[PDB]
């Protein structure tokens, strides 16, 4: 855990197919769990 959280955030930045809304939204999800 935590290690997992960083990875989750990192992937969010890393993904080229999320547009701004998709990206902002996924961050919010990572926040809920983390």
């Amino acid at each position: 855990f935590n290690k997992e959280c960083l990875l989750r955030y990192k992937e969010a930045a890393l993904d080229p197919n999320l547009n701004l809304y998709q990206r902002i939204a996924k961050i919010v999800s990572i926040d809920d769990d983390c």
């Binding site: 809304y21 902002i24 939204a25 919010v28 809920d32």
Partner: protein, 96 residues
């Protein structure tokens, strides 16, 4: 050469509607169980000086603007909703 001339400076700083970044919770203070994204919004609001202590810059004409803000309820999900804000269309310098 590369200095802003008085007449240019004086005009640009004088009381007028300027794009100001306003915090949403500060405008919607009743919405306590909501985080917003973006947490602030760009609004046309009065700003600048009247170049006299007897005068203050005030709005004389206001209109509305609506923006799609993300409304986040911590640990309970999120949705995009419309929210409406006041914009200043015209500013006057008037006595304090």
């Amino acid at each position: 050469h590369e200095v802003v001339k008085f007449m240019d400076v004086y005009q640009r700083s004088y009381c007028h509607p300027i794009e100001t970044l306003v915090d949403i919770f500060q405008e919607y203070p009743d919405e306590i169980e909501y985080i917003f994204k973006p947490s602030c919004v760009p609004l046309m609001r009065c700003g600048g000086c009247c170049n006299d202590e007897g005068l203050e810059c005030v709005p004389t004409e206001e209109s509305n603007i609506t923006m799609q803000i993300m409304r986040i309820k911590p640990h309970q999900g999120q949705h995009i909703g419309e929210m409406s804000f006041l914009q200043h269309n015209k500013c006057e310098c008037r006595p304090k």
